[PDB]
Design a protein around this ligand. Structure first.
Ligand SMILES: [K+]
Ligand SMILES: [K+]
Ligand SMILES: [K+]
Ligand SMILES: [K+]
Ligand SMILES: [K+]
Ligand SMILES: [Mg+2]
Ligand SMILES: [Mg+2]
Ligand SMILES: [Mg+2]
Ligand SMILES: [Mg+2]
Ligand SMILES: [Mg+2]
Ligand SMILES: [Mg+2]
Ligand SMILES: [Mg+2]
Ligand SMILES: [Mg+2]
Ligand SMILES: [Mg+2]
Ligand SMILES: [Mg+2]
Ligand SMILES: [Mg+2]
Ligand SMILES: [Mg+2]
Ligand SMILES: [Mg+2]
Ligand SMILES: [Mg+2]
Ligand SMILES: [Mg+2]
Ligand SMILES: [Mg+2]
Ligand SMILES: [Mg+2]
Ligand SMILES: [Mg+2]
Ligand SMILES: [Mg+2]
Ligand SMILES: [Mg+2]
Ligand SMILES: [Mg+2]
Ligand SMILES: [Mg+2]
Ligand SMILES: [Mg+2]
Ligand SMILES: [Mg+2]
Ligand SMILES: [Mg+2]
Ligand SMILES: [Mg+2]
Ligand SMILES: [Mg+2]
Ligand SMILES: [Mg+2]
Ligand SMILES: [Mg+2]
Ligand SMILES: [Mg+2]
Ligand SMILES: [Mg+2]
Ligand SMILES: [Mg+2]
Ligand SMILES: [Mg+2]
Ligand SMILES: [Mg+2]
Ligand SMILES: [Mg+2]
Ligand SMILES: [Mg+2]
Ligand SMILES: [Mg+2]
Ligand SMILES: [Mg+2]
Ligand SMILES: [Mg+2]
Ligand SMILES: [Mg+2]
Ligand SMILES: [Mg+2]
Ligand SMILES: [Mg+2]
Ligand SMILES: [Mg+2]
Ligand SMILES: [Mg+2]
Ligand SMILES: [Mg+2]
Lengths: 118, 97, 205, 244, 233, 152, 124
RNA sequence: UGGCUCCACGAGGGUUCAGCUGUCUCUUACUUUUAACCAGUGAAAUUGACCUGCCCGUGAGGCGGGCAUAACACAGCAAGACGAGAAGACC
RNA sequence: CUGCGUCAGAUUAAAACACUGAACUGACAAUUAACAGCCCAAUAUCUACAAUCAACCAACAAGUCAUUAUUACCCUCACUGUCAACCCAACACAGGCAUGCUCAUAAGGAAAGGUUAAAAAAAGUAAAAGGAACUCGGCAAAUCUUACCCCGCCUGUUUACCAAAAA
RNA sequence: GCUAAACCUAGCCCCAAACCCACUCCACCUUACUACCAGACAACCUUAGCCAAACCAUUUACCCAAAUAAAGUAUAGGCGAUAGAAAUUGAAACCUGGCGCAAUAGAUAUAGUACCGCAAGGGAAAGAUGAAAAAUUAUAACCAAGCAUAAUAUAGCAAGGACUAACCCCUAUACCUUCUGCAUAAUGAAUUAACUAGAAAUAACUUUGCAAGGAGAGCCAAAGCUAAGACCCCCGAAACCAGACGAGCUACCUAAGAACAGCUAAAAGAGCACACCCGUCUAUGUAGCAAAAUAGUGGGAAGAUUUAUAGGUAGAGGCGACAAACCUACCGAGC
């Protein structure tokens, strides 16, 4: 391609323009109502027991009349607690491994370069 | 095959670093300090292995009794299985009776 | 975007080039070279600066650095610490011999005082205005960052506007008048589009 | 590795944080209390020490409660603490015979009760123990207001208690609107259970119900920044004018 | 893939130490072999040519501008010493020191054909002193560097002895010395502070005598013919 | 617009308008023989033929008559060193027919004459290499491998 | 036997699956009796392209431009630049009350507007 | 409640008249495939090591007494290598 | 789910072969809706009489195709499938695979790498005279034969992969 | 001299301390990752069993919130295998570590990826230059098994005594394990490299310390007490129980479809006979084309027929014109 950087420049410029417009819209929304988000949402537990940010959709009938919305479950039964604990323990194992590896790397680096100690 | 063709790099051991120079200090803290401190109070390690000694079954039982509630699910299950296996082995197997 | 393996080793060829791709295939797993960590504030070697080589084939010589690699603490001195390699080599030609430099370390070279050609030790100190500069321990003075050509190779001093380049005055003029309207309704009013029908309220959940 | 805290402390830790931490202190204490319920299916010894007949020595004895299974159908009635007993039995009461699973169930009756405080009639499923407890307490209202939750063992009973406490706190005129004399008579007959309204409003609420109620209380739409900005601007202008 | 161009849009560029060839070709006059015997007339003609060539004097002035402490009267001896040291480096194949005496363009001509051979080269005698035939300099800031070329004439006695891989004699004779006349060019990167004069190329006059024949016989195969193609003279 | 929430519409509702569009299209050379008045585009997957018609009529003032769209499936047969399939993206191809009988052809975006250097270019490395190539000559067969550097 | 590691698209499955699965395009109508598609004109997005004649701006900015420091726009800055002068002028005049915020620019409700701010009913 | 028979039907279990034929007396000729040689590609079961003979005896290529005996490649053969062969059956 | 379309390839392994070598690698291109999928406002109220050329006649197993009264309703052609030498069997497997036409093709393919004609082995053809003498048995092959005994009324079902039977 | 061999990092293990992550825009419970229509649809209920008791049937330890001691005591128990308290007493605690592993080790991990299975699920292997590869003229020598350089000459567990001399001469019944005893024709081994299998201190013995006392609360003591040293393996069943996953094959059923030429006959669970379904006999094949096929010959082929699609019955079970058949290529009880 003759000038590939032109495409990158155009993409960056369009991203900047969209950023400016969205910033103006966000400032106006904060001034008029104060909502930090343009789309309604909520914090709910799914069937798997993890907190999720559910983004609301738009319908024509209220939620209690809706069939598909009512079929979806937003509560977790007690059998997911053990799996949540297992996930937490797995994350703890990964974090501990990362920390120990970082400490080992620091010790090896100090051994190899004495003037880091000095 | 099975043996290295090059000499390993030489290993330098500082016989006079801080730990080697100060190793053994305060081992007689009780004798020389009016018995305010016990030498086993200088033990740094697991909570269940401070000032105590025993075989593998005893160590497993002590660990389960001390920190059993804080262990992860998999580790606790493995500890229970190990205790059962060691119990069976020690109480039901051996040359001597 | 960027596809670099965790232990990708940086070399003379820039990452993503044909030579770099051939040297470091995606599947290669070599021993990671241990590099002394230098903070961004602590690093003080910059392109276009004259530095003297302390150790090597030709020590005590001063040369201007042409390339720097912060990943390996490498500084490449132009025309110094060079070996010779054949280029333009084919099955019928014996090749053209050209010199190519080798990497140097920040400990291997020492920055030199421009007014007194002798290597010195330099620390970062602030000016009266707060601007950060580097001052040497011995015979303290200010050695600013040498001017270096831009990465994109653009020269504002010799820049001529093209048919699709916005003029400076038009790009600088301010037209935004702050108000409490959105771009959509502002443009609708500007273009004269009329919408009388209202939006019936819907259910969000 | 090891957790910082034991697993059984995690419920208290999560009560210490989040929306649970903003619940009323009295409600939190009431939930935290773990007093032992009254024995029903086992007979307490009554003494801390007893003489062992075989060796004639004073040995300490304890009352070990017997586990009770409360089916979900018991939350719509007043069983009075009785429940299903799930256990094992030796055939013919002989240790050398087989061990068989056994389930003991209480006998249930659908009686009609009238509440003087609530001025309403309820048809609930109760037991002979519940009827005896009501007779001992001298009235359904007295029984509900006296027996704690660990003896009521009924969400419906806790709801009745909350309603009665709320009415007593509010001195609600809806109880016999045209007979203030009778309303005052009932209120002074049950005056001994007077509870402040802000504390009676949370009586009998489960953890989920309390969390939902607190979320409803905290549910306020955000105030637009325009109001706060104009308020701070006008305050600054007033202070500047005073300085002038 | 081609290695001609390193990746583009790169600040770093390949640094060069020497030019591709002589900036201005020098044509040796016919009969310089006779002028060699006419030693006095050789000196007179060299002086006259240097005086008459204004470009030579301007180039020398530029060289003095870039390095004032430079002399023309002493350079022939230094050039002879550099020549002899460079040719002696071939005997022990010390390319590390040869890099400091010859140019990167001269190096292939001195190493590629003697990669796998043993050369016993020695300098025995000098018939006529060297003389600076012509001095010329590179264009001003052609790529940011300035080079200078100095032409010298050598008429000296040398010895050549080249052996094959197995040590069998392949070319030359190690005892008898023979006369050699050649024009030697020297190049130096004036702009580079650490640059120095190094032997760069040599000039082969069209009237040069044919070189010494080789020991063995060589067969040159004719044009191989495909079945459809017949032989054509 | 793509990756956005379209507001729900009800009877008597306002006309739906888009002021800034993220739809980007590419005019492409057809790989097979096509009629004169047919132009080929690669368009985003969330774009319909009605949207393409309005897009071309509004932004580019191009009168269109008929639009026909299809979806091309990207090859998934590529496998890397880990033997994991690499997916080429699926893309939507649209064919647009001009309205008033105009004829469109795809011109040559890379003319050979324009590729040829009309101006002068002097690359130092290229000059050095070509000079060395022209100066260096193959060894004379009658020399038989004897180095040509020695003047003796 | 089935490939469960590939994206589930409309090209996979029987006729019902292929005809029912979409590809992301928005709907612009509804199907009535007889499988007849009725298209609603006001559900088709309208590209509001302005008039570009006599436009000074160009896609690329000349490099001969000063580098103004980046200052993100905030609600406080917008309020100070827009409503602060009118509010301070009205305060200096002396006839001010919180019941005139509608005249000052404040919108008590979004209902009855073509462009609601929360939730917004207009596209990008 | 118990016992017999009747027509039709059957890749069901036996038998019969005639014809038929290489089933046989007693096999032969031809064609294809296979096969053997040349060229390309190229497995598996198995395998303690073997420099791996016969007769007689003893408890058999390996022990004892005799006999035999330059080395080696290809195509058949199935007497032996309790041919792992080939697994099953019986207490 | 792109899997013998185009270009290029140090290529070179598809049970051999390859220079255009290629059913391998990299890049580019493609299958355009009329066929098909994706349908339908509400509340009440209708719907005994098969099909079989449906006329004969003859039935039993008794069958595969229907609305009206009223209210509401006038915007219309969007989205998706469309390629191939292809699926299930670890394989470019002599196997398994629904429907409409072609009933032998107008469409689709190649049993033999080259040679010689040893043994043994597989298939086929021909055979003097005899015609079951072979064999547990007319097993196979040839011809188009009759009658009987035992068992089960008969059609049908069963041990996918050693028993199709008298069960 | 070919195949090869070596090459140290990636990271991992055990602790201490400290309480951890989860909205860029859009989509994601319908056939998940699918912009957009009237519903009622909801969780709570003792673990069992293997194993020990040399069978087995009552019974058989399983963190329940303070280290030590009381104490293996009181108690329980086919009073037996075994189980087993409490009152009472009370204890310190400074993460920045290792007489841990170094690519068959250490996590399975380069990755829960490739691949296998309908599904639950199972689950890998590997890398190695150099300061500089913008030095490829480079990461030289030698080293397991297997070959080549370089086939073989009577005779024999292949060796030993020897010899001038390789053989020729004399002597010599392979190894481990199991049985009293084997060369036995009883089991195992083609070869090479790496990995792979004896864990505990009651009593006694040896050497120290102190001594009628020993021991850093508790215990022992009529020379004892305290401390140390030193003894107790690996692999392999048919099985049992709990909780998930399977009726895309097959057994049966439900919904709505499809196919059956020609002839004789008669309104046939009729006959001959294609498509089609099945598989009596023979031959080939037996690591095959095929974990059940091919050629011929056969029964049925308008019916209790064959068959495409969707759905249902799930293992203490289903289904079955009972073959102990079939339930995803080993069903007297699936995975
Ligand atoms: K039959
Ligand atoms: K034989
Ligand atoms: K056997
Ligand atoms: K069967
Ligand atoms: K592994
Ligand atoms: Mg039959
Ligand atoms: Mg053959
Ligand atoms: Mg062959
Ligand atoms: Mg093998
Ligand atoms: Mg022999
Ligand atoms: Mg005998
Ligand atoms: Mg014998
Ligand atoms: Mg013998
Ligand atoms: Mg043979
Ligand atoms: Mg279409
Ligand atoms: Mg249609
Ligand atoms: Mg095959
Ligand atoms: Mg078949
Ligand atoms: Mg052949
Ligand atoms: Mg005959
Ligand atoms: Mg006979
Ligand atoms: Mg006969
Ligand atoms: Mg006979
Ligand atoms: Mg007979
Ligand atoms: Mg027959
Ligand atoms: Mg029958
Ligand atoms: Mg009959
Ligand atoms: Mg069978
Ligand atoms: Mg059969
Ligand atoms: Mg819809
Ligand atoms: Mg709808
Ligand atoms: Mg037992
Ligand atoms: Mg038994
Ligand atoms: Mg206690
Ligand atoms: Mg590993
Ligand atoms: Mg070897
Ligand atoms: Mg012998
Ligand atoms: Mg058992
Ligand atoms: Mg079970
Ligand atoms: Mg089903
Ligand atoms: Mg089925
Ligand atoms: Mg018919
Ligand atoms: Mg029939
Ligand atoms: Mg059947
Ligand atoms: Mg039979
Ligand atoms: Mg038939
Ligand atoms: Mg059946
Ligand atoms: Mg039976
Ligand atoms: Mg039976
Ligand atoms: Mg099975």
């Amino acid at each position: 391609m003759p000038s590939p950087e032109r495409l990158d420049k155009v993409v960056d410029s369009m991203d900047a323009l969209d950023k400016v417009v969205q910033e103006r819209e966000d400032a106006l929304r904060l001034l008029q109502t104060g909502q930090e988000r343009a789309r309604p949402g909520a914090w709910r537990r799914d069937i798997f027991g993890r907190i999720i940010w559910h983004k609301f959709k738009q319908w024509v009938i209220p939620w209690h009349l809706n069939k598909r919305y009512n079929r979806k479950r937003f509560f977790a039964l007690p059998y997911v607690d053990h799996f949540l604990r297992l996930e937490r323990e797995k994350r703890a194992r990964i974090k501990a491994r990362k920390e120990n590896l970082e400490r080992k790397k620091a010790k090896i680096l100090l051994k190899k370069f004495p003037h880091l100690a000095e | 095959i099975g043996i290295r063709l090059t000499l390993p790099p030489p290993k330098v051991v500082d016989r006079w670093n801080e730990k080697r120079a100060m190793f053994g200090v305060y081992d007689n803290i009780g004798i020389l300090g009016n018995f305010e401190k016990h030498p086993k109070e200088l033990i740094r390690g697991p909570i269940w292995l401070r000032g105590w000694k025993g075989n593998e079954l005893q160590r497993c039982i002590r660990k389960r009794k001390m920190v059993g509630s804080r262990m992860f699910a998999d580790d606790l299950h493995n500890l229970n299985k190990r205790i059962r296996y060691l119990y069976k082995h020690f109480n039901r197997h051996g040359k001597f009776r | 975007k960027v596809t670099l393996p965790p232990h990708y080793r940086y070399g003379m060829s820039p990452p993503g080039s044909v030579a770099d791709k051939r040297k470091n295939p995606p599947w290669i797993r070599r021993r990671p070279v241990v590099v002394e960590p230098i903070s961004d504030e602590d690093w003080y070697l910059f392109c276009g600066d004259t530095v003297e080589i302390l150790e090597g084939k030709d020590a005590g010589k001063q040369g201007k650095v042409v390339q720097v690699i912060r990943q390996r603490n490498w500084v490449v001195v132009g025309g110094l610490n060079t070996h010779y390699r054949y280029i333009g080599k084919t099955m019928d030609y014996r090749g053209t011999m050209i010199p190519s430099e080798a990497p140097l370390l920040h400990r291997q070279v020492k920055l030199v005082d421009p007014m007194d050609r002798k290597p010195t030790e330099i620390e970062w100190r602030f000016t009266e205005a707060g601007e950060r500069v580097r001052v040497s321990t011995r015979s303290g003075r200010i050695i600013p960052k040498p001017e270096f050509p831009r990465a994109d190779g653009i020269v504002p001093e010799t820049w001529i506007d093209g048919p699709k380049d916005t003029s400076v005055e038009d790009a600088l003029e301010r037209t935004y008048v702050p108000c409490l309207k959105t771009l959509q309704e502002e443009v609708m009013e500007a273009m004269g589009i009329k919408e009388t029908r209202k939006y019936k309220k819907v259910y969000w959940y | 590795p090891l957790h910082k805290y034991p697993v059984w402390l995690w419920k208290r830790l999560q009560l210490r944080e989040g929306i649970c931490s903003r619940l009323p202190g009295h409600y939190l204490r009431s939930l935290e209390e773990e007093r032992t319920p009254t024995p029903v299916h086992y007979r307490p010894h009554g003494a801390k020490f007893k003489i062992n007949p075989k060796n004639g020595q004073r040995e300490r004895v304890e009352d070990v409660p017997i586990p009770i299974y409360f089916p979900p159908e018991s939350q719509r009635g007043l069983w009075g603490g009785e429940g299903w007993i799930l256990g094992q039995i030796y055939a013919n009461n002989d240790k050398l015979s087989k061990r068989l699973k056994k389930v003991w169930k209480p006998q249930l009756f659908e009686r009609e009760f009238y509440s003087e405080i609530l001025d309403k009639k309820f048809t609930v499923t109760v037991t002979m123990r519940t009827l005896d407890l009501i007779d001992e307490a001298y009235g359904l209202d007295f029984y509900i207001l006296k027996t704690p939750k660990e003896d009521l063992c009924s969400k419906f009973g806790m709801d009745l208690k909350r309603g009665m406490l709320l009415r007593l706190a509010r001195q609600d005129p809806q109880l016999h609107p045209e007979d203030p004399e009778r309303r005052a008579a009932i209120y002074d007959k049950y005056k001994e259970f007077a509870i402040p309204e802000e504390e009676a409003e949370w009586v009998g609420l489960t953890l989920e119900e309390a969390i939902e109620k607190q979320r409803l209380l905290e549910e306020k739409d955000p105030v637009p920044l325009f109001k706060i900005y104009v308020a701070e601007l006008i305050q600054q202008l007033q202070q500047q004018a005073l300085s002038e | 893939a081609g290695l001609v161009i390193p990746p583009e849009k790169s600040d770093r560029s390949i640094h060069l130490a020497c030019t591709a060839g002589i900036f201005d070709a020098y044509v040796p006059p016919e009969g310089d072999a006779r002028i060699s015997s006419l030693s006095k007339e050789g000196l007179i003609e060299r002086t006259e040519r240097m005086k008459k060539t204004m470009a030579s004097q301007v180039s020398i002035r530029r060289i003095k501008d870039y390095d004032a402490n430079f002399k023309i009267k002493d350079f022939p001896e230094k050039a002879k010493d550099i020549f002899i040291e460079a040719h002696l480096c071939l005997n022990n194949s010390d390319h590390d020191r040869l890099h400091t005496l010859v140019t990167e363009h001269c190096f292939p001509d001195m190493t590629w054909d003697i990669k796998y051979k043993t050369v016993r080269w020695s300098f025995v005698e000098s018939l006529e002193p060297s003389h600076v035939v012509q001095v010329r300099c590179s264009s001003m800031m052609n790529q940011g560097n300035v080079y200078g070329q100095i032409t010298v004439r050598m008429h000296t006695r040398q010895t050549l002895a080249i052996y094959d891989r197995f040590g069998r004699l392949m070319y030359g004779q190690e005892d008898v010395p023979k006369d050699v006349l050649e024009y030697v060019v020297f190049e130096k990167q004036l702009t580079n502070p650490y640059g120095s004069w190094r032997m760069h190329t040599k000039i082969v006059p069209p009237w040069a005598p044919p070189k010494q024949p080789i020991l063995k016989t060589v067969m040159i195969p004719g044009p191989q013919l495909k079945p459809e193609e017949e032989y054509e003279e | 617009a793509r990756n956005v929430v379209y507001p729900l519409y009800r009877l008597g509702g306002p006309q739906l308008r888009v002021f800034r569009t993220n739809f980007f299209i590419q005019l492409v050379r057809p790989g097979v023989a096509q009629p004169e008045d047919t132009v080929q585009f690669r368009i985003p997957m969330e774009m319909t033929r009605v949207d393409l018609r309005n897009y071309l009529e509004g932004i580019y003032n191009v009168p269109v008559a008929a639009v026909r769209t299809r979806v091309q499936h990207g090859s998934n047969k590529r496998r890397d060193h880990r033997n994991v399939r690499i997916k080429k993206p699926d893309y939507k191809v649209a064919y647009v027919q001009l309205a008033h009988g105009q004829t469109f052809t795809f011109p040559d975006l890379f003319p050979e004459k324009d590729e040829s250097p009309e101006g002068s270019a002097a690359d130092d490395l290229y000059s050095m290499l070509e000079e060395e190539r022209q100066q260096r000559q193959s060894s004379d067969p009658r020399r038989g491998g004897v180095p040509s550097w020695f003047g003796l | 036997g089935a490939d469960r590691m590939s994206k589930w698209t409309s090209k996979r499955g029987p006729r019902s699956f292929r005809g029912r699965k979409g590809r992301g395009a928005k709907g612009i109508g509804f199907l009535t009796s007889g499988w007849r598609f009725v298209q609603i004109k006001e559900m088709v997005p309208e590209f509001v392209v302005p008039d570009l004649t006599g436009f000074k701006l160009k896609p690329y900015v000349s490099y001969l431009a000063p580098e103004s420091e980046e200052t993100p726009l905030t609600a406080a800055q917008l309020f100070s630049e827009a409503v602060a002068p009118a509010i301070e002028k009205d305060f200096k005049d002396g006839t001010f009350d919180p019941d005139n915020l509608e005249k000052y620019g404040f919108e008590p409700t979004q209902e009855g507007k073509l462009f609601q701010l929360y939730p917004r009913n207009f596209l990008r």
